[PDB]
GROMACS .gro file of N, CA and C in nm:
model
  393
    1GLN      N    1  -1.552   0.582   3.847
    1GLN     CA    2  -1.426   0.509   3.876
    1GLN      C    3  -1.442   0.363   3.819
    2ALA      N    4  -1.342   0.298   3.779
    2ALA     CA    5  -1.350   0.159   3.735
    2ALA      C    6  -1.210   0.094   3.774
    3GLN      N    7  -1.096   0.111   3.696
    3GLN     CA    8  -0.977   0.067   3.734
    3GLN      C    9  -0.968  -0.089   3.744
    4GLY      N   10  -1.053  -0.166   3.662
    4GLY     CA   11  -1.069  -0.307   3.673
    4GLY      C   12  -1.134  -0.356   3.542
    5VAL      N   13  -1.114  -0.286   3.440
    5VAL     CA   14  -1.157  -0.320   3.314
    5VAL      C   15  -1.039  -0.322   3.208
    6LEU      N   16  -1.007  -0.434   3.143
    6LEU     CA   17  -0.887  -0.458   3.054
    6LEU      C   18  -0.944  -0.540   2.939
    7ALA      N   19  -0.869  -0.529   2.826
    7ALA     CA   20  -0.898  -0.613   2.709
    7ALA      C   21  -0.773  -0.662   2.647
    8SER      N   22  -0.773  -0.758   2.551
    8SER     CA   23  -0.681  -0.820   2.476
    8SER      C   24  -0.664  -0.759   2.340
    9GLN      N   25  -0.550  -0.782   2.267
    9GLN     CA   26  -0.534  -0.750   2.118
    9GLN      C   27  -0.571  -0.874   2.043
   10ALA      N   28  -0.600  -0.866   1.915
   10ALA     CA   29  -0.580  -0.973   1.821
   10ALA      C   30  -0.548  -0.929   1.676
   11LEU      N   31  -0.527  -1.020   1.591
   11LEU     CA   32  -0.478  -0.993   1.457
   11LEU      C   33  -0.569  -1.072   1.357
   12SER      N   34  -0.559  -1.043   1.237
   12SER     CA   35  -0.593  -1.128   1.119
   12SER      C   36  -0.488  -1.103   1.000
   13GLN      N   37  -0.491  -1.186   0.904
   13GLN     CA   38  -0.418  -1.182   0.782
   13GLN      C   39  -0.504  -1.248   0.677
   14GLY      N   40  -0.450  -1.266   0.558
   14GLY     CA   41  -0.498  -1.359   0.464
   14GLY      C   42  -0.539  -1.286   0.336
   15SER      N   43  -0.462  -1.302   0.223
   15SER     CA   44  -0.480  -1.258   0.085
   15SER      C   45  -0.423  -1.352  -0.010
   16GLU      N   46  -0.481  -1.352  -0.124
   16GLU     CA   47  -0.453  -1.432  -0.247
   16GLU      C   48  -0.413  -1.320  -0.356
   17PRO      N   49  -0.339  -1.363  -0.463
   17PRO     CA   50  -0.285  -1.268  -0.552
   17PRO      C   51  -0.392  -1.222  -0.661
   18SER      N   52  -0.376  -1.106  -0.707
   18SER     CA   53  -0.471  -1.051  -0.821
   18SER      C   54  -0.400  -0.931  -0.878
   19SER      N   55  -0.454  -0.892  -1.003
   19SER     CA   56  -0.423  -0.776  -1.078
   19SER      C   57  -0.265  -0.784  -1.111
   20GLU      N   58  -0.212  -0.670  -1.173
   20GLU     CA   59  -0.076  -0.650  -1.208
   20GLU      C   60  -0.035  -0.517  -1.134
   21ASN      N   61  -0.109  -0.427  -1.155
   21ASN     CA   62  -0.111  -0.286  -1.092
   21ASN      C   63  -0.134  -0.300  -0.946
   22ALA      N   64  -0.038  -0.282  -0.860
   22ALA     CA   65  -0.054  -0.256  -0.716
   22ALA      C   66   0.067  -0.172  -0.677
   23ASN      N   67   0.052  -0.097  -0.564
   23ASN     CA   68   0.170  -0.028  -0.502
   23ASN      C   69   0.141  -0.020  -0.350
   24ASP      N   70   0.237  -0.057  -0.268
   24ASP     CA   71   0.226  -0.066  -0.125
   24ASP      C   72   0.179   0.071  -0.067
   25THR      N   73   0.066   0.096  -0.045
   25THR     CA   74   0.005   0.222  -0.007
   25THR      C   75  -0.079   0.206   0.111
   26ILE      N   76  -0.038   0.272   0.225
   26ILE     CA   77  -0.126   0.283   0.349
   26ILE      C   78  -0.258   0.353   0.320
   27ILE      N   79  -0.356   0.321   0.396
   27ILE     CA   80  -0.493   0.376   0.386
   27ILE      C   81  -0.526   0.420   0.526
   28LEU      N   82  -0.608   0.522   0.541
   28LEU     CA   83  -0.653   0.567   0.668
   28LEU      C   84  -0.803   0.537   0.677
   29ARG      N   85  -0.855   0.511   0.796
   29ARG     CA   86  -1.008   0.493   0.829
   29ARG      C   87  -1.037   0.576   0.951
   30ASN      N   88  -1.164   0.572   1.001
   30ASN     CA   89  -1.221   0.643   1.113
   30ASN      C   90  -1.237   0.787   1.091
   31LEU      N   91  -1.197   0.839   0.973
   31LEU     CA   92  -1.194   0.987   0.944
   31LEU      C   93  -1.333   1.039   0.931
   32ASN      N   94  -1.351   1.170   0.935
   32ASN     CA   95  -1.488   1.238   0.928
   32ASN      C   96  -1.495   1.324   0.803
   33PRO      N   97  -1.615   1.359   0.759
   33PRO     CA   98  -1.639   1.438   0.628
   33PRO      C   99  -1.558   1.561   0.635
   34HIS      N  100  -1.529   1.615   0.757
   34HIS     CA  101  -1.458   1.753   0.762
   34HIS      C  102  -1.315   1.736   0.779
   35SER      N  103  -1.259   1.621   0.795
   35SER     CA  104  -1.105   1.603   0.837
   35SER      C  105  -1.026   1.665   0.714
   36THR      N  106  -0.917   1.712   0.749
   36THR     CA  107  -0.805   1.789   0.675
   36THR      C  108  -0.692   1.684   0.643
   37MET      N  109  -0.614   1.721   0.530
   37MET     CA  110  -0.482   1.660   0.496
   37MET      C  111  -0.400   1.666   0.631
   38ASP      N  112  -0.406   1.780   0.700
   38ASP     CA  113  -0.309   1.811   0.807
   38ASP      C  114  -0.299   1.698   0.903
   39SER      N  115  -0.395   1.624   0.949
   39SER     CA  116  -0.400   1.523   1.050
   39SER      C  117  -0.301   1.419   1.010
   40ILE      N  118  -0.302   1.386   0.881
   40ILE     CA  119  -0.218   1.274   0.829
   40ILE      C  120  -0.071   1.330   0.827
   41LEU      N  121  -0.045   1.452   0.766
   41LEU     CA  122   0.085   1.504   0.742
   41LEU      C  123   0.153   1.522   0.890
   42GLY      N  124   0.076   1.570   0.985
   42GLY     CA  125   0.123   1.588   1.115
   42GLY      C  126   0.167   1.465   1.181
   43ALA      N  127   0.083   1.351   1.158
   43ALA     CA  128   0.112   1.221   1.228
   43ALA      C  129   0.240   1.175   1.177
   44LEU      N  130   0.268   1.170   1.050
   44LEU     CA  131   0.385   1.115   0.988
   44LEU      C  132   0.506   1.199   0.981
   45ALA      N  133   0.500   1.316   1.017
   45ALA     CA  134   0.607   1.429   1.012
   45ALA      C  135   0.738   1.376   1.047
   46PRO      N  136   0.763   1.333   1.177
   46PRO     CA  137   0.894   1.278   1.204
   46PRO      C  138   0.937   1.136   1.168
   47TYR      N  139   0.852   1.067   1.095
   47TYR     CA  140   0.852   0.923   1.065
   47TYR      C  141   0.854   0.896   0.922
   48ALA      N  142   0.868   0.993   0.836
   48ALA     CA  143   0.864   0.981   0.693
   48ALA      C  144   0.936   1.098   0.631
   49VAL      N  145   0.964   1.079   0.494
   49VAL     CA  146   1.018   1.190   0.410
   49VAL      C  147   0.929   1.200   0.293
   50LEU      N  148   0.806   1.268   0.311
   50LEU     CA  149   0.709   1.271   0.207
   50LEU      C  150   0.642   1.403   0.210
   51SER      N  151   0.529   1.434   0.132
   51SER     CA  152   0.452   1.548   0.141
   51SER      C  153   0.309   1.518   0.091
   52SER      N  154   0.245   1.628   0.063
   52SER     CA  155   0.109   1.625   0.003
   52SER      C  156   0.086   1.577  -0.139
   53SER      N  157   0.212   1.522  -0.201
   53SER     CA  158   0.196   1.424  -0.310
   53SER      C  159   0.134   1.299  -0.255
   54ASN      N  160   0.205   1.246  -0.151
   54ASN     CA  161   0.180   1.114  -0.100
   54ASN      C  162   0.031   1.104  -0.034
   55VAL      N  163   0.011   1.204   0.054
   55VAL     CA  164  -0.116   1.221   0.133
   55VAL      C  165  -0.215   1.266   0.023
   56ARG      N  166  -0.320   1.180   0.008
   56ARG     CA  167  -0.431   1.220  -0.076
   56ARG      C  168  -0.566   1.185  -0.006
   57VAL      N  169  -0.672   1.244  -0.042
   57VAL     CA  170  -0.797   1.227   0.021
   57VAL      C  171  -0.917   1.252  -0.075
   58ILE      N  172  -0.963   1.143  -0.120
   58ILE     CA  173  -1.084   1.128  -0.215
   58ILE      C  174  -1.213   1.172  -0.125
   59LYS      N  175  -1.288   1.255  -0.194
   59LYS     CA  176  -1.409   1.317  -0.145
   59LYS      C  177  -1.533   1.226  -0.172
   60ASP      N  178  -1.655   1.260  -0.131
   60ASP     CA  179  -1.778   1.192  -0.171
   60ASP      C  180  -1.838   1.254  -0.297
   61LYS      N  181  -1.930   1.184  -0.363
   61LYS     CA  182  -2.004   1.229  -0.481
   61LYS      C  183  -2.136   1.312  -0.447
   62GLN      N  184  -2.210   1.263  -0.345
   62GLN     CA  185  -2.330   1.333  -0.312
   62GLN      C  186  -2.304   1.466  -0.240
   63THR      N  187  -2.182   1.480  -0.183
   63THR     CA  188  -2.138   1.606  -0.119
   63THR      C  189  -2.010   1.653  -0.183
   64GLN      N  190  -1.941   1.745  -0.118
   64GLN     CA  191  -1.815   1.788  -0.144
   64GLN      C  192  -1.719   1.783  -0.025
   65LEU      N  193  -1.729   1.677   0.053
   65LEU     CA  194  -1.669   1.635   0.188
   65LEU      C  195  -1.604   1.511   0.167
   66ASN      N  196  -1.537   1.458   0.273
   66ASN     CA  197  -1.457   1.335   0.270
   66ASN      C  198  -1.556   1.204   0.267
   67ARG      N  199  -1.485   1.093   0.240
   67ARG     CA  200  -1.549   0.958   0.251
   67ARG      C  201  -1.489   0.880   0.373
   68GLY      N  202  -1.438   0.941   0.472
   68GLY     CA  203  -1.405   0.868   0.595
   68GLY      C  204  -1.274   0.789   0.576
   69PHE      N  205  -1.203   0.792   0.467
   69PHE     CA  206  -1.075   0.718   0.445
   69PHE      C  207  -0.984   0.829   0.384
   70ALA      N  208  -0.860   0.790   0.366
   70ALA     CA  209  -0.759   0.870   0.291
   70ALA      C  210  -0.649   0.779   0.252
   71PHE      N  211  -0.540   0.824   0.169
   71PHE     CA  212  -0.434   0.733   0.114
   71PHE      C  213  -0.296   0.798   0.151
   72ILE      N  214  -0.187   0.716   0.152
   72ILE     CA  215  -0.056   0.743   0.156
   72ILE      C  216   0.037   0.647   0.078
   73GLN      N  217   0.104   0.688  -0.022
   73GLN     CA  218   0.186   0.607  -0.093
   73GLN      C  219   0.329   0.595  -0.033
   74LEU      N  220   0.393   0.477  -0.024
   74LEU     CA  221   0.516   0.443   0.034
   74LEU      C  222   0.601   0.344  -0.042
   75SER      N  223   0.730   0.340  -0.011
   75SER     CA  224   0.821   0.229  -0.056
   75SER      C  225   0.761   0.104  -0.006
   76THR      N  226   0.803  -0.020  -0.070
   76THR     CA  227   0.745  -0.157  -0.022
   76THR      C  228   0.780  -0.188   0.122
   77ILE      N  229   0.903  -0.189   0.151
   77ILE     CA  230   0.948  -0.230   0.280
   77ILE      C  231   0.914  -0.125   0.385
   78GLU      N  232   0.910  -0.002   0.336
   78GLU     CA  233   0.867   0.121   0.434
   78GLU      C  234   0.726   0.106   0.460
   79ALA      N  235   0.641   0.066   0.374
   79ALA     CA  236   0.495   0.052   0.388
   79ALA      C  237   0.475  -0.042   0.498
   80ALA      N  238   0.533  -0.166   0.473
   80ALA     CA  239   0.540  -0.284   0.557
   80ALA      C  240   0.625  -0.273   0.684
   81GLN      N  241   0.678  -0.145   0.725
   81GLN     CA  242   0.736  -0.122   0.852
   81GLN      C  243   0.661  -0.005   0.914
   82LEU      N  244   0.613   0.091   0.843
   82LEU     CA  245   0.549   0.203   0.893
   82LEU      C  246   0.417   0.164   0.963
   83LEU      N  247   0.345   0.067   0.899
   83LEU     CA  248   0.217   0.012   0.949
   83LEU      C  249   0.221  -0.015   1.091
   84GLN      N  250   0.328  -0.087   1.146
   84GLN     CA  251   0.338  -0.140   1.282
   84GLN      C  252   0.363  -0.014   1.367
   85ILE      N  253   0.438   0.087   1.323
   85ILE     CA  254   0.454   0.212   1.398
   85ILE      C  255   0.321   0.279   1.431
   86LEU      N  256   0.235   0.294   1.323
   86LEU     CA  257   0.116   0.372   1.321
   86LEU      C  258   0.002   0.312   1.414
   87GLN      N  259   0.018   0.188   1.452
   87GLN     CA  260  -0.068   0.117   1.536
   87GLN      C  261  -0.065   0.176   1.677
   88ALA      N  262   0.031   0.271   1.709
   88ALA     CA  263   0.052   0.329   1.842
   88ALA      C  264   0.039   0.485   1.855
   89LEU      N  265  -0.002   0.547   1.744
   89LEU     CA  266   0.008   0.699   1.745
   89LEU      C  267  -0.120   0.761   1.690
   90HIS      N  268  -0.142   0.891   1.713
   90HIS     CA  269  -0.242   0.973   1.658
   90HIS      C  270  -0.208   1.118   1.664
   91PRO      N  271  -0.236   1.204   1.565
   91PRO     CA  272  -0.199   1.342   1.552
   91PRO      C  273  -0.283   1.429   1.648
   92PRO      N  274  -0.239   1.547   1.683
   92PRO     CA  275  -0.307   1.648   1.758
   92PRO      C  276  -0.433   1.705   1.681
   93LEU      N  277  -0.446   1.678   1.547
   93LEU     CA  278  -0.551   1.739   1.472
   93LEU      C  279  -0.680   1.667   1.479
   94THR      N  280  -0.730   1.630   1.612
   94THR     CA  281  -0.844   1.558   1.640
   94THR      C  282  -0.971   1.645   1.623
   95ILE      N  283  -1.009   1.673   1.503
   95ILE     CA  284  -1.139   1.736   1.462
   95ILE      C  285  -1.241   1.649   1.518
   96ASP      N  286  -1.353   1.682   1.567
   96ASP     CA  287  -1.476   1.608   1.597
   96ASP      C  288  -1.450   1.475   1.678
   97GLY      N  289  -1.349   1.482   1.756
   97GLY     CA  290  -1.300   1.359   1.840
   97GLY      C  291  -1.235   1.252   1.742
   98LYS      N  292  -1.193   1.286   1.630
   98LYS     CA  293  -1.142   1.188   1.523
   98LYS      C  294  -1.003   1.160   1.543
   99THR      N  295  -0.976   1.045   1.602
   99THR     CA  296  -0.842   0.982   1.586
   99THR      C  297  -0.838   0.899   1.466
  100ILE      N  298  -0.726   0.825   1.437
  100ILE     CA  299  -0.694   0.792   1.297
  100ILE      C  300  -0.656   0.644   1.313
  101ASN      N  301  -0.718   0.562   1.245
  101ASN     CA  302  -0.680   0.413   1.234
  101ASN      C  303  -0.556   0.393   1.152
  102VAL      N  304  -0.514   0.267   1.124
  102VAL     CA  305  -0.415   0.225   1.029
  102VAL      C  306  -0.464   0.097   0.959
  103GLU      N  307  -0.445   0.089   0.824
  103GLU     CA  308  -0.466  -0.025   0.753
  103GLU      C  309  -0.380  -0.020   0.632
  104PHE      N  310  -0.368  -0.131   0.541
  104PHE     CA  311  -0.270  -0.135   0.430
  104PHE      C  312  -0.335  -0.178   0.301
  105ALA      N  313  -0.345  -0.078   0.207
  105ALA     CA  314  -0.416  -0.095   0.083
  105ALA      C  315  -0.315  -0.131  -0.017
  106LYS      N  316  -0.237  -0.228  -0.004
  106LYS     CA  317  -0.147  -0.282  -0.104
  106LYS      C  318  -0.235  -0.384  -0.203
  107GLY      N  319  -0.155  -0.465  -0.281
  107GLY     CA  320  -0.220  -0.578  -0.358
  107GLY      C  321  -0.103  -0.665  -0.390
  108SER      N  322  -0.061  -0.669  -0.508
  108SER     CA  323   0.076  -0.726  -0.562
  108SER      C  324   0.187  -0.656  -0.501
  109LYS      N  325   0.304  -0.719  -0.510
  109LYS     CA  326   0.441  -0.665  -0.484
  109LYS      C  327   0.487  -0.572  -0.590
  110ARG      N  328   0.623  -0.534  -0.595
  110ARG     CA  329   0.686  -0.492  -0.726
  110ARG      C  330   0.809  -0.573  -0.745
  111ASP      N  331   0.868  -0.542  -0.861
  111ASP     CA  332   1.015  -0.586  -0.904
  111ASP      C  333   1.055  -0.458  -0.982
  112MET      N  334   1.193  -0.456  -0.989
  112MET     CA  335   1.264  -0.358  -1.088
  112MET      C  336   1.227  -0.398  -1.222
  113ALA      N  337   1.205  -0.283  -1.302
  113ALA     CA  338   1.185  -0.286  -1.450
  113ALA      C  339   1.210  -0.159  -1.516
  114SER      N  340   1.178  -0.143  -1.639
  114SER     CA  341   1.175  -0.019  -1.715
  114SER      C  342   1.053  -0.037  -1.812
  115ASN      N  343   1.031   0.073  -1.879
  115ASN     CA  344   0.936   0.074  -1.999
  115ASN      C  345   0.985   0.166  -2.105
  116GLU      N  346   0.913   0.166  -2.213
  116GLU     CA  347   0.932   0.251  -2.327
  116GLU      C  348   0.809   0.239  -2.412
  117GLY      N  349   0.750   0.350  -2.467
  117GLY     CA  350   0.639   0.345  -2.565
  117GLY      C  351   0.615   0.505  -2.594
  118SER      N  352   0.530   0.531  -2.694
  118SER     CA  353   0.481   0.655  -2.725
  118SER      C  354   0.370   0.703  -2.628
  119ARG      N  355   0.337   0.827  -2.627
  119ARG     CA  356   0.231   0.888  -2.531
  119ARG      C  357   0.180   1.007  -2.628
  120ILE      N  358   0.084   0.983  -2.712
  120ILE     CA  359   0.018   1.078  -2.805
  120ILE      C  360  -0.130   1.044  -2.794
  121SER      N  361  -0.221   1.154  -2.795
  121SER     CA  362  -0.355   1.140  -2.825
  121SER      C  363  -0.402   1.265  -2.902
  122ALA      N  364  -0.444   1.251  -3.023
  122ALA     CA  365  -0.494   1.364  -3.107
  122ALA      C  366  -0.596   1.308  -3.210
  123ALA      N  367  -0.651   1.399  -3.280
  123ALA     CA  368  -0.734   1.356  -3.401
  123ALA      C  369  -0.717   1.459  -3.509
  124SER      N  370  -0.783   1.583  -3.477
  124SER     CA  371  -0.764   1.699  -3.566
  124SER      C  372  -0.788   1.822  -3.486
  125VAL      N  373  -0.776   1.941  -3.543
  125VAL     CA  374  -0.790   2.066  -3.476
  125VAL      C  375  -0.851   2.162  -3.565
  126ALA      N  376  -0.987   2.190  -3.545
  126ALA     CA  377  -1.056   2.296  -3.621
  126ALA      C  378  -1.159   2.357  -3.518
  127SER      N  379  -1.159   2.494  -3.514
  127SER     CA  380  -1.216   2.563  -3.408
  127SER      C  381  -1.279   2.704  -3.459
  128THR      N  382  -1.304   2.721  -3.589
  128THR     CA  383  -1.369   2.835  -3.642
  128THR      C  384  -1.456   2.792  -3.761
  129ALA      N  385  -1.538   2.883  -3.799
  129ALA     CA  386  -1.622   2.882  -3.929
  129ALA      C  387  -1.604   3.017  -3.998
  130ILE      N  388  -1.686   3.047  -4.102
  130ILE     CA  389  -1.705   3.177  -4.155
  130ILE      C  390  -1.862   3.194  -4.171
  131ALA      N  391  -1.906   3.303  -4.197
  131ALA     CA  392  -2.052   3.336  -4.240
  131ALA      C  393  -2.040   3.471  -4.326
   0.00000   0.00000   0.00000
């Protein structure tokens, strides 16, 4: 029994600009080598309109298991509003007692634009001999 132990919350911020390429992408932490995509998809189910395109999970090199993090791509404003929601929730997919943090792996902003250019890569094609 205790009923006499309480703590406070705190925050931090602080970033400087870098790169060109960024996209407002949420990042997961606290995860385990065995965690599934499911935990993330289940958490965001009623709070997003996304799928397993958005939810991605880089593995380790020494193993073929996870690296304790994962990714979610979002719209700019939506990334910067979803984050605050996620500070209060966790999915039922608690493998190995693993609840799910929230953090924000953005960088730069965006603006509206377009592009144009070619996309070709070739050299030659030869794949036989004779004898």
